[PDB]
Amino acid sequence: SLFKDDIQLNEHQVAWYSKDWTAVQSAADSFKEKAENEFFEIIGAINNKTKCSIAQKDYSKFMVENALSQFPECMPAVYAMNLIGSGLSDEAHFNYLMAAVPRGKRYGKWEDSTEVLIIKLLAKRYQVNTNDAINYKSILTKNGKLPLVLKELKGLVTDDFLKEVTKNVKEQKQLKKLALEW
Amino acid sequence: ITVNEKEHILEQKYRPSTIDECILPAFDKETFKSITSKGKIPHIILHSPSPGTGKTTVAKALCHDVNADMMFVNGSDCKIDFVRGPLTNFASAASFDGRQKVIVIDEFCRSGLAESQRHLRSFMEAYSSNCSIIITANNIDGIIKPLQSRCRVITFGQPTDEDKIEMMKQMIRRLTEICKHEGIAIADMKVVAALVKKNFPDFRKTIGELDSYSSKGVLDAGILSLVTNDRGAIDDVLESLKNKDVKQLRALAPKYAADYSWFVGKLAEEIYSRVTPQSIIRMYEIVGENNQYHGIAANTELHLAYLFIQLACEMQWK
Amino acid sequence: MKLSKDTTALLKNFATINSGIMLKSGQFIMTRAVNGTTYAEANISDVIDFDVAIYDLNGFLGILSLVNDDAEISQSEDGNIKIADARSTIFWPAADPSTVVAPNKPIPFPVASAVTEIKAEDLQQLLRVSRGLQIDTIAITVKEGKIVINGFNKVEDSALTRVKYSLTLGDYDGENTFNFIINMANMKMQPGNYKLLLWAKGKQGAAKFEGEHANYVVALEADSTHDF
Amino acid sequence: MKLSKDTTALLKNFATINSGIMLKSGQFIMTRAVNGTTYAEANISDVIDFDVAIYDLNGFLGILSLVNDDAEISQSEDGNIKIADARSTIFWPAADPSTVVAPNKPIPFPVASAVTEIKAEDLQQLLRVSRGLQIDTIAITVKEGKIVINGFNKVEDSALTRVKYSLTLGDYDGENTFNFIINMANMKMQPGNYKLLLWAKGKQGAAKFEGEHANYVVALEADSTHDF
DNA sequence: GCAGACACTACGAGTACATA
DNA sequence: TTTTTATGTACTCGTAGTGTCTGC
């Protein structure tokens, strides 16, 4: 047993002093801090006139433009970078948007799950597009039992299909959501 | 009249199997029959920017009338690794009963498929002896010109007056067969011819409106009441425009970036009747210049968002 | 229905041709390739009771790989497939027969235009040489009376010019000249002896492999030539 | 022109030194690592009748392990390498000799600065202890008048200070003091008794292993210190 | 007469990159 | 005061399953 009144080394020492590496793996995970990442704060520097100095930060014209796509006052420069900003340097992209966005004071933010599984499930079945799939459901909600076609498609709801739309934790409350359809 | 009795949606269930059964204008019906008469099919890009004209049915009809070993795939699911794997293993091998091999790519003008499109040039040439490709396009410019080099660009022509008179009653007797085959009570057609004329070219939206009346037993009602113009008018084209809802205007852009050319074109047509002449001349400048630059347009989505913000804040809606 | 070791191994083979399989009542199982290039059939010793379609045949055999050999595969009173173990019990969801592309049409092979037989260790050596020599296409022709299988590198060799391997399989009798090219990829038979049946007339043809238990019918590449 | 299994065993060893090999006609073969790290020369029991360069010697022998040992090798009219078997034939492509880094002439090893004589089982134990003590570099030097080998763990040792082994080999009758370092990764010789010849002049150096049929020139390390 | 253990491959993950 | 969208490509790392070789 435990030698009672001896000093117990920390769990790192316990795992490390044992060639049991699965516990050492648990020891390293204790410092993961992946929830404590960074992400942007360059947009805030764009509309605040702050020394961003991106270089190593993850720059995405896809994203950085689409964030200013919500604010219509920043849209003239976003419309330009959409036009001619293709093939323009990342460092140049932030530098153009520096003197291009008006004032700063970074602001707020920027179609549901149980519908979007049916829409994407009808789309793959009949090999149609989103637009066509969306209309299919809307007409099927009105007519010859959409509940019937839900059962026709209970077999091809794989976890690869599911997790592809909303990973998080829903694709398990959605996996066995459309289970009860018989 | 061909019915896939195992089908649950009337659009897919009453799909014509033969090119004859297709309700198509003259010159086209003459063209496709000429193509099927040859017994061998060349690369075809048949395209029509108007929805529900019969792009997908004709593509499948040509595969049937020629007795093809068809592999039908949607363009969106037709990525490049899909072309390397299955599509190649298909067109490389020869079918056991001979017969033409065809690969139909439905709605291949989708934007993300540009690089897999670039794979097909040389793919189509390497296997042109054993297999041809039919491409269904909504926006023809979405097809890289080297593919149009390899394909026959069939554009669905504007149906003449005789074509409109004949196709409607051809669709009428088609609606007679399906309703009598489905069990729907006709209760005298009367409005049935008016429904076909209501959405004349769009036969798919006409059949789709027969659906929603399957729970009902009647064929007659004021169908121009429930989601009539559920295409270019009842999808925030009115309400969300005017009020200058920037938040909604931006969220309404994506749902349409798919087919930019149609949308804009229908946007310049119906708008001429909602706003003042001072904004009539004004809307053409901004819409003309947004359409003028849809190529430099890296992201078509944000290009629509710029059209909406400049359109909503300058139109004197009456 | 009970699934033995020889039958699950066959299903592990048929899974390679189609991600799932449709099987109706009897002892005859059959699957075809999605594109329609490889058709496999098999009469087996284990008898199945009902008709069922499995979409995830690979995952179905993996879940079955935890239950003892007494595995009772039954239909659920609602419709699914329950797997009864000596202790535990699993529930697997069955799929619609139209989700799994089924062969459906087991039309018999015609008359054999040419006949030979390939040994088990001869197929073995062909598949093991190709693994080391990167052979992607093989052509079956005649050389000096005896018929042979030649392997190439279609990518490294456009029109199959330079041979990289050749296996003789006995002599041809009739005075015909041909060269049936088969893709090595769409050639998914399991190890064993196969009486090779070759049928081709005009511009259509196929290759049938008659194993002691199952049959594999593959398609021939369009480049193939024959004077039949 | 068949290759005996001891000759091929020596060939699969040479493939560790260089991924290819350039072998001319005769009984003599040789190769040198691309990074000028090791050089092996050997006369063998079989006779090569034609010059050929093999771009992938590893895959060549791995394929040659698939035909029977009586396989007759030759230069086909298909100008490559013909592997005639009882029934099969393998056409292994001959490679352009310009793509195979090979010693254009056998390295005439200079007069040895020091001569010792490793035993085969002494070499065997040296490899076993290295795989157990993570010994990556060894040094051959003088210890109390005898030539010994001492291995380290350059990863943990860095400066090469903590001795981890000492194979006391022969005795040294000279007066020089040397510390020749060899990297274990360059010990590509097959097990067998070797007469070890050492040479070093200034900032140069190499070690030679004279065998009962195969010789090996392995390079010394940058930190080799000597007074020759 | 096979196990062990190194040796090899495949794959999930994560990463960085270029496009529309 | 916010936190994500598609396709295709190339590379590294970690681990885990599979392959070839060896014992006092």
Ligand SMILES: Nc1ncnc2c1ncn2[C@@H]1O[C@H](COP(=O)(O)OP(=O)(O)O)[C@@H](O)[C@H]1O
């Ligand atoms: N020319 C036509 N003749 C007969 N039916 C048609 C025709 N065009 C469309 N349809 C009907 O519309 C449905 C879908 O047509 P589809 O080929 O998808 O057109 P599109 O691809 O242009 O939307 C079919 O089920 C068919 O019944």
Ligand SMILES: [Mg+2]
């Ligand atoms: Mg369509």
